[PDB]
Amino acid sequence: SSGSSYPSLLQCLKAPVLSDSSCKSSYPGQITGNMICVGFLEGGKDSCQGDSGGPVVCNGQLQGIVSWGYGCAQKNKPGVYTKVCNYVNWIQQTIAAN
């Protein structure tokens, strides 16, 4: 159930992976190698609270997990996503042993 503020219907957004230099300069001191920025530096389109954990899928492959940002859809504050291409071995080995 969607409660007070979430939508009932699943929402979709097309967005590009951003360069690491754009990501680090958007969020100085806060970006690790396990994070990727996806979205628009001009703001307006972004993920938001309630989206965390959900997918960023590029060319049929899960590349991002909705993680955090400053606000939502803010200028120069694109979404920051967990970088899935760092974790295939963690995922496969954890699944294989559990």
Partner: protein
């Protein structure tokens, strides 16, 4: 999702809703027993809702399966959200069909400028 559009119903068949009374986070089905999500979505008990489009209305494609295991990345940092990843084991395997399906893990990292699809029931 701010500034998006409504997905075609069940056109994102790997998308799940994490529910503890109400929707609070998303996830992605990567095999019939396992959902990958974010570690800061951790709760001690989680119901995974697959096959959803309208999370408030029973449509007939839903599968509601309680989590049997919830595993956060051991190096998750709750202050910086580094290693913000989590795996949820379903207590019984989801039935895979045209509306409930898995998404492939990446075979390499995506290049800057690659266009991707983001989805969820977050604030619009």
């Amino acid at each position: 999702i701010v500034g998006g559009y409504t997905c075609a119903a069940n056109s994102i068949p790997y998308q799940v809703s994490l529910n503890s009374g109400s929707h609070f986070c998303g996830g992605s089905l990567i095999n019939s027993q396992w959902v990958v999500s974010a570690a800061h979505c951790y709760k001690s008990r989680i119901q995974v809702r697959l096959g959803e489009h309208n999370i408030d209305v029973l449509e007939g494609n839903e599968q509601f399966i309680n989590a049997a295991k919830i595993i956060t990345h051991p190096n998750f940092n709750g202050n910086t959200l580094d290693n913000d990843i989590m795996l949820i084991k379903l207590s019984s395997p989801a039935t895979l069909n045209s509306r409930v399906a898995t998404v492939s893990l990446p075979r390499s990292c995506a290049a800057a400028g690659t266009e991707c699809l983001i989805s969820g029931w977050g604030n619009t």
